[PDB]
Amino acid sequence: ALTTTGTEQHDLFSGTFWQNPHPAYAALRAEDPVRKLALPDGPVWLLTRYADVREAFVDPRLSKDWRHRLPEDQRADMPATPTPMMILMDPPDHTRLRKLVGRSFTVRRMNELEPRITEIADGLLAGLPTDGPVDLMREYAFQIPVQVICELLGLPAEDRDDFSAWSSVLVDDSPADDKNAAMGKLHGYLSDLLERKRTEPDDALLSSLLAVSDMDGDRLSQEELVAMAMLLLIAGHETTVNLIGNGVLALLTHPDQRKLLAEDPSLISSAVEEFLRFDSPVSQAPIRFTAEDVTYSGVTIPAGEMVMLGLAAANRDADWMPEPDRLDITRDASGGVFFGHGIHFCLGAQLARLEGRVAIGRLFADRPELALAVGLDELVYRRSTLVRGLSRMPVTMGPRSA
Ligand code: HEM
Ligand SMILES: [Ca+2]
Ligand SMILES: [Ca+2]
Ligand SMILES: [Ca+2]
């Protein structure tokens, strides 16, 4: 198994790491900031220092084109992507696709979702028991973002168990063949759904994008259109959930911060920014490929290598954030790499923040006696190189507020 080199040995992507990766991240930052991880499916490098991570995001030698892993005499005949999602592309196709979908995620559009997000959260809360067992992950944190993405896109509620199963396999330590099969089912499902939508459109996003694609296939191809639906669905199932889970947990394990929020509920948006920093939901950005040799902190990563940008690590770098290990919901937030940086910066950043403050804010308002129903040490985390997220969170809700 892998451990940090230097003065302190901490497990890496195994052992104690899943439970609490933060000491390992700190030892990487201090003593091995540009680290090659000899992982089972092949070596992946990891950058953990804030100044390196933030700049890496705008360094074009750090490419999304997986063909950089091939020698040139092998690249000609290969597709640009395994599936034509914009997150797996460089300009110009990235630029074109992002500009197109960005038109549907304008500031005004996402905000007008607040009354509905609030109904959804309020309905979930009303349905939770006072003292019987609750998994706050499956019953609350998971539900909000998934209902929202289904409504935004126009995804049948009756198919929710099929595509949430597919989506989670793609995001965790599943075997590469399992991921391929899940992606296959998700592509076919969404392809068939789009075919049905042509015949009966609705007013939600997938119909709108299908119409753009119908009108102008060079702006958005059919395959690009399915890939976009796939990406938006997976983001709606596997990200915000862990903002909610990690942020709730931060408050449950920090009484002082929970009390400040109780006394000023308007601290919630500042609190959300602090949760995104303190326990980043996307722990490592999806992989980049070195198109040429790059040098960061005195270490050269050769051309052709796979590279993770360590967001959870960088967001606790004391060179950037004083007392990075302290949870302080009152910080005036700025910077941060939890939503990425540059051209691929999170498309759903406004949506995620809104879902987070609504879900966490309304939860603690409604159930001011919420508590964990197990010891902190008993919490099980998912094994993922992409997310920092609880598997389940046993809680006791307590009485509704009067
Ligand atoms: C707290 C929740 C979220 C976190 C922490 C997060 C994190 C990120 C990060 C770090 C990136 C950049 C990855 C990279 O450059 O390699 C990204 C991109 C992206 N995100 Fe988010 N995300 C969240 C929620 C959402 C939501 C709700 C959506 C729904 C629309 C979404 C959709 C996308 C898309 C489509 C991209 C690709 C953007 C592009 O390639 O231009 N995300 N996200
Ligand atoms: Ca119930
Ligand atoms: Ca219409
Ligand atoms: Ca500094």
- Residue 396 token pair: 């006791």
Nearest residue to 202 via CA among 150, 147, 144: 150
Mutate which of 81, 106, 284, 346 to test ligand 1's pocket (most atoms within 8 Å of Cβ)?
346
Tell me which H or E stretch contains 38: strand 34-39
Whether 348 lines ligand 1, by a CB cut-off of 6 Å, is yes
How many angstroms separate the first and last alpha carbons of the chain? 52
CA of 310 to the centre of ligand 4 (A): 18
Q: Is the peptide bond before 286 cis (omega within 30 degrees of 0)?
A: no
Q: Count CB atoms within 10 A of the CB of residue 335.
A: 13
**SS3 for 331?**
coil
DSSP-derived 3-state class of residue 272: helix
Give the C-alpha separation, 272 to 274, whole Å.
5
Query: Which residues have a beta carbon within 5 Å of ligand 2, which is an ion?
Result: 127
Q: Cβ distance 395 to 134 under 8 Å?
A: yes
Query: Which residue's alpha carbon is nearest to atom 34 within ligand 1?
Result: 347
* Separation between Cα atoms, residue 279 and residue 183, nearest integer Å: 28
Indicate whether residue 381 lines ligand 1 (CB < 6 A). no
Closest atom of ligand 1 to CA, residue 87: 40
E strands within 287-384? 288-290, 294-296, 299-301, 306-309, 371-372
What are the helix and strand counts (H, E) for the chain?
16, 12
Q: What is the CATH number of the domain that holds 60?
A: 1.10.630.10
Q: Please report the atom of ligand 1 found closest to the CA of residue 86.
A: 40
For 85, the domain range is 1-402
Task: Return the ligand number nearest the Cα of 308.
Answer: 1
Residue 72's φ and ψ, nearest 5 degrees, are: -50, -35
Please state the domain count of the chain: 1
Instruction: Kindly state if the Cβ of 338 falls inside 6 Å of ligand 1.
Output: yes
235 CB within 6 A, ligand 1: yes
Ligand 1 contact via 361 beta carbon (within 6 Å): no
Cα 240 to averaged position of ligand 1 atoms, centre (Å): 10
Distance 289 CA to ligand 1 centre (A): 19
Ligand nearest to the CA of 197: 3
Ligand 1 in reach of 240 Cβ (< 6 A): yes
Q: What is the DSSP string of 348-377?
A: THHHHHHHHHHHHHHHHHH-TT-EESS-GG
Query: Which residues is 38 bridged to in the sheet?
Result: 43
Q: Which ligand is nearest to the CA of 207?
A: 3
The amino acid that residue 293 corresponds to is: D
**Which residues are documented as binding site for heme?**
346
